[PDB]
Design a protein around this ligand. Sequence first.
Ligand code: P04
Length: 328
Amino acid sequence: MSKARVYADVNVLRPKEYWDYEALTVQWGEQDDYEVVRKVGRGKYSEVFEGINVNNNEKCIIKILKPVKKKKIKREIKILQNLCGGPNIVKLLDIVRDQHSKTPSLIFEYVNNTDFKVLYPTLTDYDIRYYIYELLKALDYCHSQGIMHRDVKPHNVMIDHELRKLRLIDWGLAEFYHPGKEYNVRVASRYFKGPELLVDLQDYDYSLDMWSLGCMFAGMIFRKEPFFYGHDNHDQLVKIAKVLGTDGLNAYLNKYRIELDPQLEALVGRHSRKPWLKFMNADNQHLVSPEAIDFLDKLLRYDHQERLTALEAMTHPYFQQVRAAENS
Ligand SMILES: O=C1CCCCc2cnn3c(NC4CC4)nc(nc23)Nc2cccc(c2)N1
């Protein structure tokens, strides 16, 4: 029986309307209010376009949804509404639908993002500390609001490097946290899935996002995108084991009385733990400070209960300069 070490009773103490997203009655706006300029992205659940609000002539992002169940769509919407206004949380501006097809679109604020594949390599030591701190503000906020993002990855972190503005986007996989509830482990993305998902531990919590965050952080400081380059879910777990070592994995599995599928156990095998410094090189040396390593190490732990919470992460000495600059 696992539960979150923080914010566990958030949804318990709030009115049922807050988390009972299926009781949501969607209020639709006018679909002609937003004109499509051009496609900018996509997902297996939608098509994303740069658009313009015909009212104020301001930019916006139009996320057109592919056939999706009523329940699933109400969840994303409710979550977006519950979080609207929080630190660095993407803003849902409108909700429209095509009358004939019933194709729904979610209208969001626009961010002049730069492909992380091109942006990250240019980020300075301080830039990394800065943006990660900004992302942390978003995570602690949603967690404090009883919500797990469940899909943290560079692709869901929009960044306008010029304005140094950051937004955590796409809450399509997010869920409300309820103590003891068993969730679907088919969430998050390849490379960023936490061990709990890879070993089928369903009663996970906000800590899942902290593993994803750690993967992101590791890729940034080590200049290796992605950090854990695995193919399928079994392989993804093996890639983690060859770094963190199988001892931690075994201890982890034992603590939660989890038994791996025979085939998987065979693939994982036996591996020793590889120090984080083994990943340092002339390409990333100017980023692998001991503080960076200490922070990373406290994020990438098999045991989700051992990981730093977002609140704790923000106070780590690694961010001391970012904070000092903010508290002034
Ligand atoms: O949930 C969403 C929509 C996010 C809207 C926020 C949002 C804000 N800017 N933005 C940008 N800016 C880039 C064009 C300059 N791209 C995407 N989303 C967004 N892309 C995108 C691509 C695939 C999926 C999603 C979003 N997912």
